[PDB]
């Protein structure tokens, strides 16, 4: 008896971490959507109808989100899927063009800059023999002064290309599934309290993410999965500066956005197949595009993320809210689509306060482009066509990506500011619960048995 | 080969502002933060701030807020598009602002965090 | 903000043996990366996340340390080595130790 | 009692060599998006094909629990029964065992194959 | 005699049992068409697989046939012996055992690990 | 002693006939070139699983070597054991009998399927 | 008199490579492995229902 | 005295991009599994016949 | 050893918009022939060998 054997096992519970291929996982009404319009729906597998995560009681796993690979991954396949759209989309080659472009038909005061160029411009036709001078609206920020005429040019025209997205498309986030493959597992922390970095009580293995719905968008994060008790502020290293915050919030702030201009859409044969969706007459007034955050609720949530703070930069300390330091428009300000097209929003109205230690809205402001440069573009960019009528969306903000200033010199007043940049951040913001594991069933071990002669 | 490569040396009266940039190259430009460093004769190292070059966003030493900028130009050539230029612009010069300034990057290990700087431009030394 | 104080602020040895250099930090749990700077050259990263070498950098220098107390071994000292050592955490540095002859 | 595929993590490997059946189960069946697909069900099939190799190319093609004649080094454990079979779990266990895996799995390749040639002697003179 | 592949479909179920290895046989050997090749040259051997995987988590990796100790449940069929296998034919047989046949493998699954974790017991004693 | 991966290429039969488990061994673990990965890839389990196919098909699951109810047809060789077991090396032996392994496949193909509806028949009166 | 090819304001137009052929070859359609396809042999079947053969 | 790129009437031309270098850098051809490579070890050996190292 | 001795120069040329011709620009210094070396010495000790 004494002498032991080894007895070889198949189907141990036991896994190592991990890397590999992914694959997505989306709903029937995705693909009721039709219209030929969401990406890679398609392609995308369904999900389940009765899904189930099996807790795992007593282990504890050690996750990090700042150093997984799924969201590299997702990343990646959303930039990819993208990418893949567009390549039936027309190419809009010929409208780098030198526009001759005025002001939009307008009186306002002196002081309000007009940013609706009328822009007329020689076009292509149908037949390589001939020409068409035809006239089109194009946002200040999708033009630029060339040169007593008043003449402009895309911007594209010296950095990039230009492909117009199909109309037959859309760009609206629907949730995906990252499902893994047979013999690996996802392992999910339970735990409500989680800053995303180390060892996790509660866990439970599952084959599929839940629903994350790709939302591309600067400084606050939207539509997003809300924390269960607390406001979480995570990071990777939080005493370091160059490492930039994520807030996820416990109470969605509902904010509501929209383009006030009843607008028109002509289109133009540049021929043959191709066809170059312009911008035509303004219906109605000319207004301002914006969004409205409730003054409360910003004030009652601003104060949960101070409360949560101070819990890491002491209790007698002040957390004042400050304005981009500047940069890029992609970053100094609050992107994102609404009804298919690109928002800028000044969150100078937002992040505007201080904090000691012991009824309307808020209207802010938004410009509006259609050649976007998204995913730090250098080669290619696209031309998001006109979307016809008038447009609002309305939208929780599920976090937000803050950044504290380096200056310190231990003063009790380190202020913070929105950041944004890379965009990893905000799948970092959803995939925290998540991690991947390469499953190895083939256990041995001495039990008393000796196989026969 | 990563390579930084900064502007020459310049004498700055009190009250100027000076200008210095860094040619980066050997990697994609776009992927790295810059940061900048001042060497202050019997005072040591000061970090002056960072930029990341996709937006060009940027953070500052909060003792120099007031007195820094930084801004990036991306290559504009077809055929060699990865390369870049960081400039630090520093204003209300005194001659306790007489340094050596660095513009530094990171490592491109999985190890390697922000701040641990193994690629270091010439220098470029300012006199007030 | 985290203050660096290296230690000795001049350390006198001879080609062949070891030099042992100090850096306590006023704040503990961080990891260190230490510089060399060569007289008149530009500075030189040695050691990241405390005891990891840099490209480049040869194994007689030794990274080591926990809490608040770092230190920078170099083993059998080269005729180049002789130079001023600095310490730093994130944008904050110590104000060196030079190693002379 | 049916806990669930991996539910036995944390349970005692005792209890865990119990749902065997389980893990074992959950294990084969469960154009961006279409290459994902392709390079995953081939990877599983792969994966799962090299533990039925091994089982193969030992005697243990039952398979879950498989006896053996090579006997436990005590160089790679030496713990009690007691203490790894109601005691440990595989997470824990698995690490300890880790350094010798391999050359473990070497013993039980040359045995088998000695079984083998030994009993086509036996059904020879039999 | 030698029927072909599929050749005793509307065969009894006797009949049929004895033309097991030709079905079994015929299921594995056998750029635009390209890719058709390799998603049907995959789906062939993961199809093929879930089967080794049943036969396998069973104690029937034999295989065709084999006995069991699930007893069988009259609610399923309750037929007589005579009337399954020298009447009726698979494709019929298979429609009426069809509401419970991931139910009756389920009783498979638990039975054949109970069968390891017991030999086990036999072997350590002796 | 260890030789290598077909190391008893030119060993005779019965000393080849020790290193099996060592072929058997490397035969499975081990956008251009991606594609030549993939159908690289599925050739291996393909051309794996045909042999396993075979071994199952037959008795020989086990494997290595299998002892069979298949009497040896003279005609095929009709050498004497020496002088293939302790004399000629595979790579020749498989050029003899080659123009009939198929034949004789089919021969293994009947007598399995006969064995297993025997011994239903067993198990059935005990 | 002057005209137009009718494609250009319906579509594009790609000229076929005189190199290929629009021969139509016979194909078959083979099942994977496990896969079976079933053939009416009936000389009397209108394509809908049980066929004997 | 007027030239052509002499491409112009054999073939279109397309511009290499420079962030792509033409070093020749050593492949190996490795086999699927069940799959062998031999390699004649013998020293004098002209390419074809029977090799036996 | 081979060379191209002239120290060539590029300028880009935009094409436009991402389009770019990279030019063969002005010839710095001594307009050369390109040319490779070999050792006429061992060039003939194998070429001695292959008549061997
Ligand atoms: C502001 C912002 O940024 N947030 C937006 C947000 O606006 C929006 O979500 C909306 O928010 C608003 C405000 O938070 C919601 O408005 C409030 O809604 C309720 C409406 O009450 C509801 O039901 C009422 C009927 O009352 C009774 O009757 C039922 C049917 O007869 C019966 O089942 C019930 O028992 C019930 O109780 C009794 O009453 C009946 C008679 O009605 C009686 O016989 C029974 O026996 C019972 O005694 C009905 O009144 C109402 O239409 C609704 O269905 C209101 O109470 C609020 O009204 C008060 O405040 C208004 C301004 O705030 C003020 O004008 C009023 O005078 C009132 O004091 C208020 O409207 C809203 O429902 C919700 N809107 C939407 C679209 O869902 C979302 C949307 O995008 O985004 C945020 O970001
Ligand atoms: C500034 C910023 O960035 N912060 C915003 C923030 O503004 C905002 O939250 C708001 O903050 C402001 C400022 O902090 C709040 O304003 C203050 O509110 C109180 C208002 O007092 C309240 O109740 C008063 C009534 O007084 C009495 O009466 C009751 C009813 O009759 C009775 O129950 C009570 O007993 C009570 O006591 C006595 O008085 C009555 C008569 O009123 C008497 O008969 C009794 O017997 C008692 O003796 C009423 O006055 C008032 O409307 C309110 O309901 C005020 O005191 C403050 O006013 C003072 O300061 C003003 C400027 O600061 C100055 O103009 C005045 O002259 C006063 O000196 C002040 O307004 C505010 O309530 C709150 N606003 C909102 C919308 O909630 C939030 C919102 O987004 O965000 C932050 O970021
Ligand atoms: C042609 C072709 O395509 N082939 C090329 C090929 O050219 C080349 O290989 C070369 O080939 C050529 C021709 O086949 C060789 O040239 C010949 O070389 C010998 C040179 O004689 C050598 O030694 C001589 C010294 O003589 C004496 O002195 C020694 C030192 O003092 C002493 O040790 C000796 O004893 C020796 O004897 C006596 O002389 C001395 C005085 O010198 C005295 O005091 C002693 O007591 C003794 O009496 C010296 O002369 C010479 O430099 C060399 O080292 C010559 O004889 C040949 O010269 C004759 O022909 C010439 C043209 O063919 C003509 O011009 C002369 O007038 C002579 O008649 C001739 O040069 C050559 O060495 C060899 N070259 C090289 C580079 O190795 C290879 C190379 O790539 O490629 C082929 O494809």
Known sequence: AENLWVTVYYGVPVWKDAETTLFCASDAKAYETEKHNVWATHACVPTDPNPQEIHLENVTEEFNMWKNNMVEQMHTDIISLWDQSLKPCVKLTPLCVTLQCTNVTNNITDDMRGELKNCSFNMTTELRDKKQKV??????????????????????????????????????????????????????????????????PSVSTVQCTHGIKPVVSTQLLLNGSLAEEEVMIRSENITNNAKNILVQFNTPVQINCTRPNNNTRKSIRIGPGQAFYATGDIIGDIRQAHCNVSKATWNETLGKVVKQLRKHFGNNTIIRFANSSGGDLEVTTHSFNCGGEFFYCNTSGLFNSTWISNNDSITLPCRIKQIINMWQRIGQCMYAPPIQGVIRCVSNITGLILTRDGGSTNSTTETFRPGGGDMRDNWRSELYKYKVVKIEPLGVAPTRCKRRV | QVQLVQSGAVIKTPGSSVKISCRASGYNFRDYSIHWVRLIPDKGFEWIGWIKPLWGAVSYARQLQGRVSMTRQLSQDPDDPDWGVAYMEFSGLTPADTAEYFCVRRGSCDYCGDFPWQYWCQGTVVVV | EIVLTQSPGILSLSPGETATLFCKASQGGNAMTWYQK???????????????????????????????????????????????????????????????? | ???????????????????????????????????????????????????????????????????????????????????????????QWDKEISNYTQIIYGLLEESQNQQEKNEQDLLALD
């Open chain 1, 135 to 200: 006239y089109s609206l194009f946002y200040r920020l999708d033009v630029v002064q060339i040169n007593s005429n008043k003449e402009y040019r895309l911007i594209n025209c010296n950095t990039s290309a230009c492909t117009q997205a199909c109309p037959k498309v859309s760009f609206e986030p629907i949730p995906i599934h990252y499902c893994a493959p047979a013999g690996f597992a996802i392992l999910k922390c339970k735990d409500k309290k989680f800053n995303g970095t180390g060892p996790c």
């Open chain 4, 1 to 91: 009692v049916f806990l669930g595929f991996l539910g036995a993590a944390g349970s005692t490997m005792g209890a865990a060599s119990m749902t065997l059946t389980v893990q074992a189960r959950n294990l084969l069946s469960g154009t961006v998006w279409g290459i994902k697909q392709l390079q995953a069900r081939v990877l599983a099939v792969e994966r799962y094909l090299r533990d039925q190799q091994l089982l193969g190319i030992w005697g243990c093609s039952g398979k879950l629990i498989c006896c053996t004649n090579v006997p436990w080094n005590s160089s790679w454990s030496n713990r009690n029964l007691s203490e790894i079979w109601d005691n440990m779990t595989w997470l």
């Open chain 3, 38 to 101: 060569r007289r008149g050259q530009v500075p030189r990263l040695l050691i990241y996340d405390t005891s990891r070498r840099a490209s480049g950098v040869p194994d007689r220098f030794v990274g080591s340390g926990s809490g608040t107390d770092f230190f920078l071994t170099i083993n059998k000292l080269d005729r180049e080595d002789f130079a001023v050592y600095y310490c730093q955490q994130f944008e904050f540095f110590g104000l060196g130790s030079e190693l002379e002859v």
